[PDB]
C-alpha cells in the first residue's frame, strides 16, 4: 500500500495523512446463463432454400417465434455472398434472445442489393423495400443465377407517388401520372404502368443476374424473449457476486431471493434511478434481487515516510467479512481499518479517519486508531457569589497567514 | 349519448416492475375527463373508427359482449382481426374475413379465406355478473396497434353506479401482445343474440399524452396525473410530484404558432435548359470538361431524378428529393 500511495502522488516521500490510492471491488466468482426452456429448433431452412422467392414489391413476411435460433450455422455457410448486420454483430447473435424475429425474402436485380440498408436512396430503397434508418438486424443475399434465371416472373416497381415508409408494402397497380396533366386507364403521355419484369436471362453479366435476398429484423427485451439463441442455461447461484445473463440481459452483481411481488406480465424490475435491480428468472419464474456486489475506495493511512514506512489501509464503506476476497482488523463506521490497532484512550485527532475516529503513530511503535478527544475536560467553579479576577497578564503575538493573490497565468 | 371518463383508461405501459416511484411515461393514454360515447346497442352496433387506440368499457348484466372485429375494409379485400370468446375458448384470428353487415354470435362466426393467424386459448370474457348479484362488473379494455403489435389491456371491477363510469382509479393490465402487423382503422363489437335476425358500452379514443404514474410499495399504479389536462397537473408533472407547495412555478413555454405558410418567389416563367446539357450530341473530353452556367431558371429536378436513364444519381450536400423546393 505505501508504494501504491507513492505512485498515486507521483512522489517518493509522502507526508503524514490519509490518501485514497485505488478502488476495491469484489470480483465475480463464476458465470450464470438463464435462457427460457424453448423446446424446439428454428425453421430457417424453410426461408433460405424456399422453392420460389417473392417479388421485391411483394416481399414475403415470416414471423419467427419460439425458436432455438442458431445463427452460427448461417454465418459459417459459404453460400451467402453478402452477410452484414447494422445493429448487432453476426458472430454475437448466438448469445442474444430477441422477439418477433421477422424474416423477409425477395429477389433483387443484382448489384443493387446495396440499396437494402438504412438510409439508402434509389429505386429499390425508395419505392420497393424501405427499412428504417435505425434498423437492427442482418441483410443476407446470395447469387441465384442457376435458380431464378430466361425468366420474367420477378417484377419491381418503377414509380411511387411518395417514398415508402419503413417496412411498407404496396400492391396497388394504378397508372402513375408522371406528367403534370391527367392520365387515366392507359399509359398516356408522360404516364407509365409502375411495374415491369427484371428479365433474368442467363446471358446477363455479373451484377445483373438474379440475387436472392433474405433480411432478418430483430426486437429485443421489449417482451418475453422468444427467438432465443442456442447458449445453454447454467445453474443458478445466489448470495455470491457473479456475472449473469437473463434472456440476454447481461450484468454483474449478487443475486438474492426477492420479496418483490411481480405481476404475471412483469419480467424485470427497476429502482427510482431507473436502474435494473430485479429480474424474474426465466426458468423457475422466481424474482431475484440484483444488488451490485461490494465496492469502495481504498485509503492508505501513513505517517511521514520520514517517521515510518508502516501504513494502515481503510476500505471505505466496506464490511470486513468480504475484503480478503480481493487481497489487525477494526470495524469503523467509515469502513474496515486494517493494520491499525484500536486503543481505548482518546487523544486529539492526528489523521482523521471519519465518524469521530482518528489514527496516529504512537508507542513497540505502531499505528493506533481511537475516538478523537475534543478537549481537556473542565468543570468551571461557578458560584452565585464567586468571581475570578486575573492578577497578572501575558502579551501574545499570534501570527496569521492569509493568501491575497495568485499567479497571473494567461 | 355521451358521458365523462373521469380517470379511466390508464394502464401499465410496459413489462417493468416499479415500486414507490413516480414515473413520467409518454404513451397513447385516454385523456382525463374526456368525453366517451355511450352506445345502447340493444333497444345497434355501429362500425366505429380506430384512430390510434380505443378505450372500450361496458357494464352489461349478462355478458352480451363477446368480442370485437378490427380491420380497415372489413369486406375480405384486406386482412382483418377477429376476437370472439365462445363459452369455452377465445379465438384470436386474422384472415381475409368476409364479414356480414351485422355481425353477431349465435346461441358460429368465423372464416378461413387466405388466412394468416390463429390463437385458440382460454377465454377472458365470461359471465361473472351472476355471482355479484346487483353489483355489476365494469369490464374495461384498451386496444392499441403500434410497432406491428396489437396490444390489449383489461381490468374488471365490481361497481354499483348505473348511468356513468365510476369516480375512481384502477390501472388496466395487459391481456395479450399479438404480433399482427395489419392496418387497423375501424372496429365494431359483436354480440350474443338468441334470436338470429340476420338483417350498453362506452368507447373512448386514446391520444399521445404524458402521464405521471404513481407506483405504490406493492408495485401497482394507484393514482396518476394527466400532465396536459390543466395548469395544475402540468405543475405537478414538471415537479414530478403529486402535491405542490405554495409558490410560482415555470411549467412550459408559450409560443404563438404560425397560421399559414407564405411563399414569395421571383416572377420567372422560362423553363431551364437542362436538355441542352444532357442531350448534347458530343460530350467534352474529361481534360477539357465543359462549364455551362445556369441562371434565371425555373429548374425542375424531379424529372432528372426519376428518369431511369441515369445509372448513378448521388448528391452530397443536398438531398435529390429536396432540390425542387430549394432555391440556388
Amino acid at each position, epitope marked *: 500500500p505505501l508504494s501504491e500511495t507513492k505512485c498515486t502522488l507521483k512522489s517518493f516521500t509522502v507526508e503524514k495523512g490519509i490518501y485514497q490510492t485505488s478502488n476495491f471491488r469484489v470480483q465475480p466468482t463464476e458465470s450464470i446463463v438463464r435462457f427460457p426452456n424453448i423446446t424446439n429448433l428454428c425453421p430457417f431452412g424453410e426461408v433460405f432454400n424456399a422453392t420460389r422467392f417473392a417479388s421485391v414489391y411483394a416481399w414475403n413476411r415470416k414471423r419467427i417465434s419460439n425458436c432455438v435460433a442458431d445463427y452460427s450455422v448461417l454465418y459459417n455457410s459459404a453460400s451467402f455472398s453478402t452477410f452484414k448486420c447494422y445493429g448487432v454483430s453476426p458472430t454475437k447473435l448466438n448469445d442474444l434472445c430477441f422477439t418477433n424475429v421477422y424474416a423477409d425474402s425477395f429477389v433483387i436485380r443484382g448489384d443493387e442489393v446495396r440499396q437494402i440498408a438504412p438510409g439508402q436512396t434509389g429505386k429499390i430503397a425508395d419505392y420497393n423495400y424501405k427499412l428504417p434508418d435505425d434498423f437492427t438486424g442482418c441483410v443476407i443475399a446470395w447469387n441465384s443465377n442457376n435458380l431464378d434465371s430466361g425468366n420474367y416472373n420477378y417484377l419491381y416497381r418503377l414509380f411511387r407517388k411518395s417514398n415508402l415508409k419503413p417496412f411498407e408494402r404496396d400492391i396497388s397497380t394504378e397508372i402513375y401520372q408522371a406528367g403534370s396533366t391527367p392520365c387515366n386507364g392507359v399509359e398516356g403521355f408522360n404516364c407509365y404502368f409502375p411495374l415491369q419484369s427484371y428479365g433474368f436471362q442467363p446471358t446477363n453479366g455479373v451484377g445483373y443476374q438474379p440475387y436472392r435476398v433474405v433480411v432478418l429484423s430483430f426486437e429485443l427485451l421489449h417482451a418475453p424473449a422468444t427467438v432465443c439463441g442456442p447458449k445453454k442455461s447454467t445453474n443458478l447461484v445466489k448470495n455470491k457476486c457473479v456475472n449473469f445473463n437473463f434472456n440476454g440481459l447481461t450484468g454483474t452483481g449478487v443475486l438474492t431471493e426477492s420479496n418483490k411481488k411481480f405481476l404475471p406480465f412483469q419480467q424485470f424490475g427497476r429502482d427510482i434511478a431507473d436502474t435494473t435491480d430485479a429480474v424474474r428468472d426465466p426458468q423457475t*419464474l422466481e424474482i431475484l434481487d440484483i444488488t451490485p456486489c461490494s465496492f469502495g475506495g481504498v485509503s492508505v493511512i501513513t505517517p511521514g515516510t520520514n517517521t515510518s514506512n508502516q501504513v494502515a489501509v481503510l476500505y471505505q464503506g466496506v464490511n470486513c467479512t468480504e475484503v480478503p476476497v480481493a487481497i489487525n482488523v477494526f470495524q469503523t463506521r467509515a469502513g474496515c481499518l486494517i493494520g491499525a490497532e484500536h486503543v481505548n484512550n482518546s487523544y486529539e485527532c492526528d489523521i482523521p479517519i471519519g465518524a469521530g475516529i482518528c489514527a496516529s503513530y504512537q508507542t513497540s511503535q505502531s499505528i493506533i486508531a481511537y475516538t478523537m478527544s475534543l478537549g481537556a475536560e473542565n468543570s468551571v467553579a461557578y458560584s452565585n457569589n464567586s468571581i475570578a479576577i486575573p492578577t497578572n497578564f501575558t502579551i501574545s503575538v499570534t501570527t496569521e497567514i492569509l493568501p491575497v493573490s495568485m499567479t497571473k497565468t494567461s | 349519448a355521451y358521458t365523462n371518463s373521469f380517470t379511466r383508461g390508464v394502464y401499465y405501459p410496459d413489462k417493468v416492475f416499479r415500486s414507490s416511484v413516480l414515473h413520467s411515461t409518454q404513451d397513447l393514454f385516454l385523456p382525463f375527463f374526456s368525453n366517451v360515447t355511450w352506445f345502447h346497442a340493444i333497444h345497434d352496433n355501429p362500425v366505429l373508427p380506430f384512430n390510434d387506440g380505443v378505450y372500450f368499457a361496458s357494464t352489461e348484466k349478462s355478458n352480451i359482449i363477446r368480442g370485437w372485429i378490427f380491420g380497415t375494409t372489413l369486406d375480405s379485400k384486406t386482412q382483418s382481426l377477429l376476437i370472439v370468446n365462445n363459452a369455452t375458448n377465445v379465438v384470436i384470428k386474422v384472415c381475409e374475413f368476409q364479414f356480414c353487415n351485422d355481425p353477431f354470435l349465435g346461441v358460429v362466426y368465423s372464416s378461413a379465406n387466405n388466412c394468416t393467424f390463429e390463437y385458440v386459448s382460454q377465454p377472458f370474457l365470461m359471465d361473472l355478473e351472476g355471482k355479484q348479484g346487483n353489483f355489476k362488473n365494469l369490464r374495461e379494455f384498451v386496444f392499441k396497434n403500434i410497432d406491428g403489435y396489437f396490444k390489449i389491456y383489461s381490468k374488471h371491477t365490481p361497481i354499483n353506479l348505473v348511468r356513468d363510469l365510476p369516480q375512481g382509479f384502477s390501472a388496466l*393490465e395487459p391481456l395479450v401482445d399479438l404480433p399482427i402487423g395489419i392496418n387497423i382503422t375501424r372496429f365494431q363489437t359483436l354480440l350474443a343474440l338468441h334470436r338470429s335476425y340476420l338483417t350498453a358500452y362506452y368507447v373512448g379514443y386514446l391520444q399521445p399524452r404524458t402521464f405521471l404514474l404513481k407506483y405504490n410499495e406493492n408495485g401497482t399504479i394507484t393514482d396518476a396525473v394527466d400532465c396536459a389536462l390543466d395548469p395544475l397537473s402540468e405543475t405537478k408533472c414538471t415537479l414530478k410530484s403529486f402535491t405542490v407547495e405554495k409558490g410560482i412555478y415555470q411549467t412550459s413555454n408559450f409560443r404563438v404558432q404560425p397560421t399559414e405558410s407564405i411563399v414569395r418567389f421571383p416572377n420567372i416563367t422560362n423553363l431551364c435548359p437542362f436538355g441542352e446539357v444532357f442531350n448534347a450530341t458530343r460530350f467534352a473530353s474529361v481534360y477539357a470538361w465543359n462549364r455551362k452556367r445556369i441562371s434565371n431558371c425555373v429548374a425542375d429536378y424531379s424529372v432528372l431524378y426519376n428518369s431511369a436513364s441515369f445509372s448513378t444519381f448521388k448528391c452530397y450536400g443536398v438531398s435529390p428529393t429536396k432540390l425542387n423546393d430549394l432555391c440556388f
Partner: antibody, heavy 132, light 108 residues
Framework: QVQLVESGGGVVQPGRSLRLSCAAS????????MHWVRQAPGKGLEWVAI????????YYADSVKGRFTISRDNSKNTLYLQMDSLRAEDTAVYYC?????????????????????????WGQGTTVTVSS | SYELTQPPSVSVSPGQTASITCSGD??????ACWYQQKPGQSPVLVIY???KRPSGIPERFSGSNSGNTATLTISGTQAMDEADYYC???????????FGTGTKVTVL
C-alpha cells in the same frame, strides 16, 4: 398424456418431517397453479394448500397452516410439499391436482385475468401415515 | 371455520334422477365444483363454474348454484354412478378452496 405422479409417501413418527414430490409432464407446468389435497382413510377430501404459477402466492388450510410449506420448481416440472411437526390427523393419501385454468401463458404472454374454477387433472396419490 | 354441509348419503333407483345438494352460508357468491370418486381411485372433475361439464363427461350431469346451496343433479343414474361426490367452494381472490363433506350416492 397430461399426468401427475406423486412420490415420497411412507411411515413417519409424530413431530418428524416429510416432503412429498409431485412430478408433472405432458403440459406446461409453469402456467398452471397447483393444489395439494389429502383424504384421511374412509373420510372425505380436504384441501391442503395451493401455490401460484410462479410461487408468489401460497395459501394453506387452517389444519396445516404454519406446519406445512408448499413449493414448486418450474424448471423441473415438480411440486413440493414440505411437512413439519406431523401429527396423527395428517394420516391421509395426498393428491396433487392441476388447475383446469392456467393463470398466465409464458409462451405467448396471454394473461386472461378471468379463470374457470375446475381442477381437471389429479395425481394418482401417495399414502402418508403418522403413528408412534 | 367453513363447513360446506352435504347429506351423508342419497339413495336413488337406477334410471331415476338423483339431486345431490351442497350447502354453505355464502356459497352463492362463490363458484362451486363437483368431483366424482370411485373407491380406490382419484377424484374426477364433473362440474365447474356451477353448470359446466369438462370435455368427456356425459351430458346427463348438471348443476346449479344460488343462495346458500349448490346442487348437482343427474338426469338418469346408471349403475356406474355409485361414487362419492364432493362439492368445493372456489374463490381465487380470497384463496378459498375448501372441499365439502362428501356424499355417497347409493344405487339400489
Amino acid at each position: 398424456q397430461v399426468q401427475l405422479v406423486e412420490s415420497g409417501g411412507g411411515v413417519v413418527q409424530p413431530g418428524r418431517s416429510l416432503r412429498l414430490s409431485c412430478a408433472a409432464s405432458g403440459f406446461t407446468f409453469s402456467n398452471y397453479g397447483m393444489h395439494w389435497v389429502r383424504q384421511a382413510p374412509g373420510k372425505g377430501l380436504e384441501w391442503v394448500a395451493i401455490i401460484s404459477f410462479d410461487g408468489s402466492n401460497r395459501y394453506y388450510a387452517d389444519s396445516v397452516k404454519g406446519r406445512f410449506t408448499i413449493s414448486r420448481d418450474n424448471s423441473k416440472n415438480t411440486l413440493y410439499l414440505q411437512m413439519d411437526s406431523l401429527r396423527a390427523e395428517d394420516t391421509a393419501v395426498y393428491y396433487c391436482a392441476k388447475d383446469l385454468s392456467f393463470y398466465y401463458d409464458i409462451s405467448t404472454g396471454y394473461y386472461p385475468q378471468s379463470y374457470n374454477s375446475g381442477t381437471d387433472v389429479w395425481g394418482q396419490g401417495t399414502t402418508v401415515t403418522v403413528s408412534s | 371455520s367453513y363447513e360446506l354441509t352435504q347429506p351423508p348419503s342419497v339413495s336413488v333407483s337406477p334410471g331415476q334422477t338423483a339431486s345431490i345438494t351442497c350447502s354453505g352460508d355464502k356459497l352463492g357468491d362463490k363458484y362451486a365444483c363437483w368431483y366424482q370418486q370411485k373407491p380406490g381411485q382419484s377424484p374426477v372433475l364433473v362440474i365447474y363454474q356451477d353448470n359446466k361439464r369438462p370435455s368427456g363427461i356425459p351430458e346427463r350431469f348438471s348443476g346449479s348454484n344460488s343462495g346458500n346451496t349448490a346442487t348437482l343433479t343427474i338426469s338418469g343414474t346408471q349403475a356406474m354412478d355409485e361414487a362419492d361426490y364432493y362439492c368445493q367452494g372456489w374463490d381465487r381472490s380470497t384463496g378459498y378452496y375448501v372441499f365439502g363433506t362428501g356424499t355417497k350416492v347409493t344405487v339400489l
